[PDB]
Amino acid sequence: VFTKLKPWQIPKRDWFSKDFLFGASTSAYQIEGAWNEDGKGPSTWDHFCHTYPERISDGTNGDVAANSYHMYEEDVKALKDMGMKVYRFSISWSRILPNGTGKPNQKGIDYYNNLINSLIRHGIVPYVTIWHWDTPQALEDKYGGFLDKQIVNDYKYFAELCFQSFGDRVKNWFTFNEPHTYCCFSYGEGIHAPGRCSPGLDCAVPEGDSLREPYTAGHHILLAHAEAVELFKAHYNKHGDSKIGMAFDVMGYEPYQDSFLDDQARERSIDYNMGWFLEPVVRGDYPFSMRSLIGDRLPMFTKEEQEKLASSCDIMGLNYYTSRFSKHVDISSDYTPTLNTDDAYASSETTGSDGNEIGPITGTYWIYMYPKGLTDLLLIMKEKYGNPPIFITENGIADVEGDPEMPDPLDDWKRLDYLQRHISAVKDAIDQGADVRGHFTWGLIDNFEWGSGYSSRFGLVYIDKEDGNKRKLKKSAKWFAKFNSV
Amino acid sequence: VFTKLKPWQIPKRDWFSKDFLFGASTSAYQIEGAWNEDGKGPSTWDHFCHTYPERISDGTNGDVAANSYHMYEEDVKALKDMGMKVYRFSISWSRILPNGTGKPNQKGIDYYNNLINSLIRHGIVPYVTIWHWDTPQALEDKYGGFLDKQIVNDYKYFAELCFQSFGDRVKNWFTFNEPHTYCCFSYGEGIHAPGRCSPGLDCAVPEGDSLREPYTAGHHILLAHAEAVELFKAHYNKHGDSKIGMAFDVMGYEPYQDSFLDDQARERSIDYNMGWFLEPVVRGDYPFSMRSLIGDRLPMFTKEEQEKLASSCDIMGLNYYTSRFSKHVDISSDYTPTLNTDDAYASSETTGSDGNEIGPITGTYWIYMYPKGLTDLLLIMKEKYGNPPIFITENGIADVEGDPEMPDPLDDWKRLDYLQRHISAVKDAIDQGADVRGHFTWGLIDNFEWGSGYSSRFGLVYIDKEDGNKRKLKKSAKWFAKFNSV
Amino acid sequence: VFTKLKPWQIPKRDWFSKDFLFGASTSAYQIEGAWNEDGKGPSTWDHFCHTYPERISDGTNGDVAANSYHMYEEDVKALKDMGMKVYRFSISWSRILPNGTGKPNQKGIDYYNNLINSLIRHGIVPYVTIWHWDTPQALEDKYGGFLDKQIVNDYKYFAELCFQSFGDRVKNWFTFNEPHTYCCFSYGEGIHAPGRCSPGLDCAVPEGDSLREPYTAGHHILLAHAEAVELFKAHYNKHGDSKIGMAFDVMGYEPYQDSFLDDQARERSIDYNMGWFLEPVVRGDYPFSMRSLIGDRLPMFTKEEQEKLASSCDIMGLNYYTSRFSKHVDISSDYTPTLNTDDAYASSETTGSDGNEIGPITGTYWIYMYPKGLTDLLLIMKEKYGNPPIFITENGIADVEGDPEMPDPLDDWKRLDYLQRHISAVKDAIDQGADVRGHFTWGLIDNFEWGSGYSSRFGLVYIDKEDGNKRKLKKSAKWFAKFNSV
Amino acid sequence: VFTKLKPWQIPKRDWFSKDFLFGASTSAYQIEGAWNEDGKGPSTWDHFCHTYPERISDGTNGDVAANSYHMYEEDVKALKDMGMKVYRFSISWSRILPNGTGKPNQKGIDYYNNLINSLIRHGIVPYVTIWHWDTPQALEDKYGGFLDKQIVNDYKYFAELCFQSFGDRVKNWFTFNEPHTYCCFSYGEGIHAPGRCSPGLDCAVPEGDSLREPYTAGHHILLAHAEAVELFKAHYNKHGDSKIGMAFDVMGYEPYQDSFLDDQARERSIDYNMGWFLEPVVRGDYPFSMRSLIGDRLPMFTKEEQEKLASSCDIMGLNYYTSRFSKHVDISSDYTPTLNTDDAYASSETTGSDGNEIGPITGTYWIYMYPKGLTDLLLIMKEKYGNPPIFITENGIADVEGDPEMPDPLDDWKRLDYLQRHISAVKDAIDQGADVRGHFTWGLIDNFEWGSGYSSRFGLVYIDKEDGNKRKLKKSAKWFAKFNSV
């Protein structure tokens, strides 16, 4: 059963200010392909798929994906056809600096310039993510990538190259995408590149430490971010019209049951899912709950680092998909953490105390529809953290290959209904004073969905693998065309 | 999954005033047995089980039940052992007037006197239901029972006999129990005695009219009630210390989805479930929504009848078990009503727009736990209907025979948790100004649960059919003993 | 006694956004005159005045009116002199298609083009009502006008001609004006053209059916509207910058007394006054209360019709003047409806339960000042119907000829105070989130006020019948000049 | 400057229910004297004053105090003269069991019986604290008192003796008084008997561990409490009319400044001040914040212990005097805890972010008047912890010897004003639904104020040390006589 909005409840572009920005998003690895063309060096995700193909559910990889390295003009056209004003995409570190450091690859740089100039030629504003899990396997080999402090300076150099190459036209940046998802899956469960986890757990490379490596990598990400923003503000914003921040993955939470214990568990879930990386850019340190639970496994910041981190984001991106119930876990002799997410002492449940699921499943097993959860997170940003400028940098659902309730990949009425409800939830937040400046649908086009390969389609625009990777507008995409008055 | 109250959320007798009354309930047919002893005449339910045994799920009947005709002293003891202050029980019309009318049966009268005097001897207050579906089959044969206006005067005579025989000690009465359930099941689906329904539907006697007979019988019930109360107030309340009303079956309702249409559907569900009989005793007429939808099938009241009905209850009983979602049904050429409940144009759903059930199932298929629903109904009584004195005259759950999650019939922690939550919901209503005067658990003892026979056990006190119908306190009963400081 | 706003409570243009639109309104019949010039065919209102002159209170008609067919440049100047940004006027069907169908009258078309081009030349935006009660008497003779389904296609053709002739410059349309007033007065009381009512009632032509004809005509209006909007969206909005909707007459309602019955009566009054035609364009069907009370007299929509109706308005106009108390009427054998308005079972009272009138009378007998009523209706639009874009397409009061408290027709301080209070009530609604986009005063100029002829003056601008129909700015008009910073 | 209540704001007995209880409090050591008479053994406080006299500010001790061992009839009379309904006093463990364990001292037992019978003879209800810091120095010598698990069983035996000796007349008990104050001052700062603290800190016996001993002693107190209550409920409450709980010392807290960090600091202050011992009797474990910050220094409970602790109090006492601002302390390498109170990572400030003190000082340096703080704590009890029955078991202020603004010890208008404001704050809480059952002023009579000796007078009733320890009613006491209508 999937109930839709009633006809009088469907969003209208009029609901939002003239300056509010509607867009769609992608990332380099997930769409570009051409993984070894024109001098590009390999990334940790090229290496991960090439050495552990079996870690991808449907046996695929990103070697070609949507082939946006060659067909980007088609991505631009699909944005124009939907009337989107913004395109959020990422730059491939290993395409522009094949060895992570050193000599830049001109053809890599030319590619982004062509995409950028084409967007601008069509009246589309580029919002660029600098790093999207996309790390040069040359840095992974040389010092273990984000597990070494050396990544900090190397990132800074990569970011500087982006600013120098594109800063004259690109005025809106995100340093990092989803640091929490990245640390948890890459170094804790190990299901994402480089695929590390504690010995005894099942991941490609069980020789890490699921209780430490996620925190080490997160710390270097925040130090990297602080250096890049200080560099940016100091030497790459002479006109003062450019903005920089980061994009966080976030889930809404509701207490599992009516108890102060689960109220407290919900606050620890939000601290750990969102505050882990948001509170450092707000106040210069991790959430107190995290330091108290994690102790010596969570690195300390120096005074100068705290000060460089605090107020380091002009804009913040929230990537929201779903919510969970938060259920309190007792501190006791019986229990010890095994994964880093266990340090929250709050289990994420899909069903609440009455046994009901939190909302309707939308296709892939983890995305349960709960738009209230997003309005709540946006009100926490407003009331607790100073109401900084917020962009919903990702929001969307997947259609899963073979699902008998989704036999026509273009008839994505479920995705359309979801996105309408979430747009409506952003309007609710705005009406209550939340400073939300835009909504970017995750899924400009179907793409390589990491561990799920192409079997999970998140696009507004279908990619026909049987017809030359052709772009074909889905039902949702066609609704945006009308919504944006195209 | 069945989540319980946390330990600091468990009701205490202190939560309620000294005058608040805790009790338990039964009805004649469901516990007495002795269906043909000491001159008792047969009732419609004796006849219904005796001629259509197959309409009882487990093949049983009320011929003996808990044998409370002989073991009532044991029922009194179980009330005393739990520290209950009130006992709500019903008088068997056919036991006291074997032919419905005429000569009273002294032994019938003596039986109630003995029960009454024993309650009073043990400090227990009797709340008596005069009629509980319990109609003399002699009146059913002579003129079709409640389908004929003659029932009005015959009821009046029966009620007068009750007042004369017991009014010196019994000071609190209910004329009728659950008129809505009775009309719907006895004359609409026909699953309860006398078992009538429209030709073509499956009930014992498909020669009635599911679109008319329920309304005819309801009309005579309200006329009967008005005559009895006028008689009572005029000649049986000379001290002015006696109260009379009726007990209604009610379900809570929530809109199926977020739409004004389902808001309107919810109001029609409450009008039809509750207002059908409550609005007549409040204002002297049926709810407007019912007259407009039902037209000529819903009899008109005379001015004198309206005036006799309005303000006819000193107290009102609400029998609450569960809630439903109310989903709007369109008036259109495609659709015509077949059962009387269809005239509300609102379907009662157990799951809402998100696909979730309204609350946890508690054992039998129709009782889903949703205590909020009761607090809402109590606030409607306060804000809409003048906050008349309310008693929760029934509330409880069944344990179903053979259910593998309920293998020990005395370990009824589920029932205990349910009752605690509902008591807590009554406290919420009281804190908000609702004038709730008592809470009577349905289920003093396991009994004959109509169409489900004994397979559904609703008792606080177990009836051991393998041990001579012995009364054995369940876990819930033992909690009440502590709750009432016994 | 007529109390005015205090000086610190007077609206300022600053109260509303830059995009908010202030304008004034007229309709073809009421101002144009030239009823038989340049080939114009007659309308139902030409025929009605010409055959039943006695149905006009002061013995006048629209043959000349304000002679705006010749003096439109003066209407444009008066708008410019007040600094109005919008002019809402209507197109005369019979002027542009003398026989309703067939060959267009070029001189008719030229007239509107001249008015349109002149408005645009002076920076005034045209908001055009396509039909304003103004039906070609040739269609009335051929098949009974709106009482026949044939009107649907004929309207569609008329609307198409308007779109083709003026759509390049006119970007904002209303298909129909006040369908509820029209159905009630034209076919129910019969006081407006064509003047039909049930035999035995007093109207020009008592051979209709006041319980059926209003509903038949309303149904064809909604079908006509749906076809025209589908046609519009499909072939006349290629740039997507045009909007279309309809304008409803609405009255505010307050319960007559403190009783749930009058709460329910108020909801039936709003359903019948406003929902009759608004709920069909919102959800594709009449209000449930209407279908339940009116049954077979209210035609059914086909699925395709429901779908064409739902979400058919880009903008909605509300014509608001006054409010009433709504008093519950019982469904009973004693009472049967005689006029279509009786089907609401709620009488519209001018005085409430305390005997007080709802607000001060403003001149004509039916306009009692109650600005709260408008803010309430606007909040119902926001909370119940999805907050669609609302224009107050009419609002104003009449000065009545001979009224000794209004001896100087230019000194309309009463009208000024009323309009200020209502503008202030729109500001209240806006502050509470209502999406109100403009305010058009009814009464650009004094005009033919239907059954009241010219004896009721609704203009901001006086029309001096003793001085050649000269336009003279009243006090209210002069206040708008300052308000609009002219 | 000390502003008083306005005359229309002064509490009246009428403000509270008939069942609400007004009383006053004392403890054994602080008033009895006779420290070595009739066989009494010494306590830790006899020993502490006798071996470290210099730890008492004014050089005094409890050897005689108010000599209530002999003059108790005078204490009874003073209660009667004020019209108090309750007397809260404590039993001296070492008077009734000179060696802590073994043979009871009859003369000790007779003394309490005489006091008890006299109270009851005068219509005064006894509320008895079993242990009030008052530990037998024989148990301190034998195994280190509360630092050894053996105290658990020894307490149980002492409590059993109290129940057997006085349970027939005493129906309301508190197992322990102020466990948090006791652990903090006796084992953390070491300023109270037995006077232990970490080496290097300044207390009588700096050979303990201020980071561990307070938690060890608290754990044994809670285990002791659980055994005694289980014993009580099982064998000493056969009539079910007796209640037992404990009394907690509590301070109100307000965030130091407008920041989520200080909101979080306030919650850790309340957890540590109040939750330390309240959350165990509510849910069977310490607050989560404490386990997370304190780890291995905070002993674990067994499942059976958790279950014995949860819901172990029928009534709870709150001893409230003042409030503080709570200011967040960062977890970092720079900082390590030295005293147990440092484990909250929230400093208690007397001045807030604007530099203002939280309220007016009342005499001794730590009691700043802030009645709002109490209403807030009472609402947390209601909303968070289930609204258990609350008695304000202590509330009052000291007059300090030599203070030039308090030259007449009987003219305690400051104390009167404070107590009136707090009574008024309890009324506020009650009006908001808090279940507060009584108010006991701390200070029936001036007494030995631990480390401050007699120099701090907390009595409603003056003790004239220059006139034979005579009881003399102060101004506040005389106001209570009128308040209680004596």
Side-chain angles (χ1 to χ4, degrees), chain A residues 45-249:
Chain A
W45 267 97
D46 285 320
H47 188 265
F48 182 70
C49 288
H50 299 167
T51 75
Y52 313 100
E54 62 278 20
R55 296 306 180 165
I56 294 54
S57 291
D58 63 357
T60 57
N61 56 228
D63 293 348
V64 47
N67 191 28
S68 287
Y69 185 69
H70 297 287
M71 289 175 81
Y72 68 97
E73 289 289 2
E74 266 22 78
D75 296 338
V76 176
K77 178 184 182 299
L79 286 157
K80 189 178 66 70
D81 283 354
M82 287 183 291
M84 294 301 202
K85 296 291 190 177
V86 169
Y87 183 32
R88 177 194 169 226
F89 63 90
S90 84
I91 293 175
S92 178
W93 192 338
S94 66
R95 191 182 297 289
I96 277 188
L97 282 164
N99 293 87
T101 190
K103 179 63 170 329
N105 174 38
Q106 257 322 297
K107 285 172 189 173
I109 292 171
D110 300 322
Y111 169 61
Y112 299 115
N113 270 149
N114 289 159
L115 167 54
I116 288 162
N117 297 329
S118 176
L119 293 167
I120 286 174
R121 174 197 179 72
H122 295 90
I124 299 169
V125 179
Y127 270 60
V128 183
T129 300
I130 294 167
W131 178 88
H132 200 303
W133 302 3
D134 208 20
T135 302
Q137 185 61 39
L139 301 184
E140 257 293 290
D141 286 327
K142 187 173 186 165
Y143 51 64
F146 273 85
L147 293 187
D148 192 88
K149 314 179 170 184
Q150 182 57 48
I151 196 69
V152 174
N153 275 164
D154 286 356
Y155 177 83
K156 178 184 184 180
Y157 179 90
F158 167 44
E160 182 158 38
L161 174 65
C162 297
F163 303 143
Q164 309 176 309
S165 314
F166 320 114
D168 60 306
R169 279 114 68 221
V170 178
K171 301 296 184 188
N172 299 283
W173 305 82
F174 297 103
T175 55
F176 292 83
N177 177 78
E178 302 198 2
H180 164 268
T181 297
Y182 168 77
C183 297
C184 295
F185 283 173
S186 310
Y187 293 101
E189 295 191 20
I191 58 172
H192 287 186
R196 300 168 62 77
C197 64
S198 297
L201 303 178
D202 172 42
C203 68
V205 53
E207 55 196 59
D209 184 342
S210 296
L211 301 175
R212 298 183 177 71
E213 291 195 341
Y215 300 120
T216 305
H219 206 252
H220 293 324
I221 283 176
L222 284 167
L223 301 183
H225 163 84
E227 294 297 311
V229 172
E230 173 178 65
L231 173 67
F232 183 75
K233 295 191 65 193
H235 297 296
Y236 296 100
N237 191 33
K238 292 291 195 178
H239 303 76
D241 59 350
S242 290
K243 298 181 184 183
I244 186 167
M246 68 163 55
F248 313 89
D249 57 289

Side-chain angles (χ1 to χ4, degrees), chain D residues 201-478:
Chain D
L201 303 178
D202 172 42
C203 68
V205 53
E207 55 196 59
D209 184 342
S210 296
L211 301 175
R212 298 183 177 71
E213 291 195 341
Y215 300 120
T216 305
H219 206 252
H220 293 324
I221 283 176
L222 284 167
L223 301 183
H225 163 84
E227 294 297 311
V229 172
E230 173 178 65
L231 173 67
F232 183 75
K233 295 191 65 193
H235 297 296
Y236 296 100
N237 191 33
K238 292 291 195 178
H239 303 76
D241 59 350
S242 290
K243 298 181 184 183
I244 186 167
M246 68 163 55
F248 313 89
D249 57 289
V250 289
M251 271 192 201
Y253 291 95
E254 293 287 29
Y256 170 85
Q257 80 199 100
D258 183 2
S259 165
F260 68 83
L261 287 176
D262 288 344
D263 293 337
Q264 292 173 335
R266 183 176 91 122
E267 296 295 346
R268 291 197 293 278
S269 297
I270 294 168
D271 278 346
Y272 191 106
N273 196 329
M274 180 168 85
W276 185 346
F277 293 90
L278 164 71
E279 193 153 312
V281 300
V282 173
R283 80 180 179 94
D285 196 12
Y286 299 112
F288 177 98
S289 54
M290 282 183 77
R291 281 208 180 294
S292 68
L293 289 164
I294 301 159
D296 286 41
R297 296 180 288 113
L298 183 58
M300 217 70 239
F301 287 107
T302 65
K303 317 283 194 179
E304 59 172 3
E305 295 167 342
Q306 305 192 318
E307 180 60 40
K308 211 185 294 267
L309 277 172
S311 305
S312 57
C313 291
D314 302 313
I315 59 176
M316 297 189 193
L318 258 36
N319 291 354
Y320 179 88
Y321 296 89
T322 182
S323 287
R324 293 290 186 273
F325 285 106
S326 180
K327 190 174 182 304
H328 167 272
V329 178
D330 273 302
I331 291 178
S332 84
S333 287
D334 294 332
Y335 175 80
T336 315
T338 54
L339 299 176
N340 61 299
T341 52
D342 291 330
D343 283 325
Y345 280 84
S347 59
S348 300
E349 304 295 331
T350 55
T351 59
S353 64
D354 56 12
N356 291 152
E357 286 178 345
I358 191 158
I361 300 193
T362 60
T364 186
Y365 66 95
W366 65 278
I367 301 178
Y368 290 76
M369 185 163 81
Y370 197 64
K372 292 183 199 72
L374 175 55
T375 299
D376 288 348
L377 294 171
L378 292 171
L379 268 298
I380 287 174
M381 293 305 300
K382 170 193 190 289
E383 304 177 329
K384 178 179 172 175
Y385 289 118
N387 205 26
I390 294 302
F391 285 86
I392 304 302
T393 37
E394 295 183 16
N395 178 224
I397 72 168
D399 295 313
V400 175
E401 182 42 29
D403 180 353
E405 300 145 24
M406 219 285 162
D408 174 358
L410 303 182
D411 185 18
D412 64 338
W413 54 268
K414 196 171 292 178
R415 164 173 300 93
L416 177 52
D417 189 67
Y418 171 102
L419 287 175
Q420 291 172 335
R421 289 173 176 273
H422 286 68
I423 288 169
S424 181
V426 167
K427 173 54 162 41
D428 294 339
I430 292 170
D431 285 348
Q432 298 174 214
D435 186 14
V436 189
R437 271 88 172 303
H439 176 285
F440 309 165
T441 290
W442 168 262
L444 168 51
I445 45 166
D446 297 336
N447 62 77
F448 180 73
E449 173 52 28
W450 312 109
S452 295
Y454 297 90
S455 67
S456 278
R457 306 187 297 275
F458 272 90
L460 284 172
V461 177
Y462 182 64
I463 292 292
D464 198 326
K465 296 305 181 181
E466 294 177 334
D467 189 7
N469 265 169
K470 180 172 303 161
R471 273 58 169 161
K472 297 178 181 186
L473 301 192
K474 302 193 194 177
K475 182 191 177 60
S476 62
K478 280 173 153 53

Side-chain angles (χ1 to χ4, degrees), chain D residues 144-165:
Chain D
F146 273 85
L147 293 187
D148 192 88
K149 314 179 170 184
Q150 182 57 48
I151 196 69
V152 174
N153 275 164
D154 286 356
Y155 177 83
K156 178 184 184 180
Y157 179 90
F158 167 44
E160 182 158 38
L161 174 65
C162 297
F163 303 143
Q164 309 176 309
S165 314

Side-chain angles (χ1 to χ4, degrees), chain B residues 17 39 43 218 237 347 364 430 438 449 483:
Chain B
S17 69
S43 71
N237 191 33
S347 59
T364 186
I430 292 170
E449 173 52 28
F483 177 83

Side-chain angles (χ1 to χ4, degrees), chain B residues 7-9 12 14-15 427 431 482 485-486, chain D residues 240 243 282-283 311 314 384-386 389 437:
Chain B
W8 59 91
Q9 301 171 325
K12 300 247 275 65
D14 265 0
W15 283 17
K427 173 54 162 41
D431 285 348
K482 296 169 50 297
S485 285
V486 178
Chain D
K243 298 181 184 183
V282 173
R283 80 180 179 94
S311 305
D314 302 313
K384 178 179 172 175
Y385 289 118
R437 271 88 172 303

Side-chain angles (χ1 to χ4, degrees), chain C residues 392-411:
Chain C
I392 304 302
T393 37
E394 295 183 16
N395 178 224
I397 72 168
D399 295 313
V400 175
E401 182 42 29
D403 180 353
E405 300 145 24
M406 219 285 162
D408 174 358
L410 303 182
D411 185 18

Side-chain angles (χ1 to χ4, degrees), chain D residues 65 90 109 167 169 179 182 217 247 250 280 358 480:
Chain D
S90 84
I109 292 171
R169 279 114 68 221
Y182 168 77
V250 289
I358 191 158
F480 268 106

Side-chain angles (χ1 to χ4, degrees), chain C residues 90-107:
Chain C
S90 84
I91 293 175
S92 178
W93 192 338
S94 66
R95 191 182 297 289
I96 277 188
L97 282 164
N99 293 87
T101 190
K103 179 63 170 329
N105 174 38
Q106 257 322 297
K107 285 172 189 173

